[PDB]
């Protein structure tokens, strides 16, 4: 479903910027990996409807962009941590040129809500933790490689409008 890049456009992009583009690996040998973590059903927060449509869409897109997609559902912050640490240690990254991480859940200012989250008992994955687990120390396989993190963490705290008259 993705509009393809022509070999002409590819060279045209490479001509406009010399060594300013991330190198891509051979299509036939590369092992691109992506991870989607979607929290739909919660202990104390309302059910996220449209999650299945969102998982489906993102999965199909990332595959069509060349990625193998792992899908994990309804995890606590502890489970997400374990899943992310495993993902960083995946052998496929060594023969990959990039990765995508997609988070779909509820959120707070600090981070992403796990399945067990409540105001009385927090279940939160910090944004800091995602970058830490995927950084150069913890994930040397993705060193010098682009790491795209997409976070949909729904907040009541979200901006936000101001009303005006013409």
């Amino acid at each position: 479903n993705v509009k393809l890049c022509s070999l002409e456009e590819a060279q045209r992009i490479w001509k406009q910027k010399s060594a300013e583009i991330y190198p891509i690996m051979d299509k036939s040998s590369r092992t691109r990996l992506a991870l989607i973590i979607c929290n739909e059903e919660f202990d104390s927060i309302p059910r996220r409807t449209g999650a299945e449509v969102d998982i489906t869409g993102m999965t199909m897109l990332l595959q069509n962009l060349g990625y193998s997609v792992d899908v994990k559902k309804n995890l606590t912050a502890s489970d997400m941590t374990t899943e992310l640490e495993a993902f960083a240690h995946r052998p496929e990254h060594k023969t990959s040129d990039s990765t995508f991480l997609v988070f779909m859940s509820h959120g707070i200012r600090e981070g992403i809500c796990g399945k067990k989250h409540s105001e009385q008992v927090p279940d939160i994955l910090q944004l800091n933790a995602i970058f830490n687990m995927l950084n150069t120390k913890n994930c040397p396989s993705l060193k010098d490689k682009p790491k795209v993190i997409i976070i949909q963490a729904a907040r009541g705290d979200s901006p936000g409008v101001v009303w005006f008259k013409d």
């Binding site: 479903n1 993705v2 509009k3 393809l4 890049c5 022509s6 456009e9 590819a10 992009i13 910027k17 060594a19 300013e20 583009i21 991330y22 891509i24 299509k27 996220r48 409807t49 449209g50 449509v53 969102d54 869409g57 993102m58 897109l61 069509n64 962009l65 060349g66 990039s98 779909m104 509820h106 959120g107 944004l127 970058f131 995927l134 950084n135 150069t136 120390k137 993705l142 060193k143 010098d144 490689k145 682009p146 790491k147 795209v148 993190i149 997409i150 976070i151 949909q152 963490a153 729904a154 907040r155 009541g156 705290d157 979200s158 901006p159 936000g160 409008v161």
Partner: protein, 80 residues
């Protein structure tokens, strides 16, 4: 001999915090990725998503680009 490497490099985050309420953000992101992956680096696609949300119809959406340590342009080169 040991060599220095940046602890955190080559990250880009795209963040939506909009109430719920597929979802408007995800759908719009898929659409722009389908259309512009061929011709635009990921950061530009994120900007274009924002542009499409410029007029606040319904619930206002303005997803931010965050914590960018990309040193190069990330082009998806779909088809390759």
């Amino acid at each position: 001999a040991i060599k220095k490497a940046h602890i955190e490099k080559d990250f880009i985050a795209f963040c939506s915090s909009t109430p719920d309420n597929g979802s408007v953000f995800i759908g719009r992101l898929i659409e722009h990725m389908q259309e512009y992956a061929c011709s635009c680096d990921v950061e530009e696609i994120f900007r274009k998503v924002r542009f499409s949300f410029e007029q606040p119809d319904g619930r206002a959406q303005m997803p931010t680009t965050e914590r960018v340590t990309l040193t190069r342009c990330f082009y998806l080169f779909p088809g390759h």
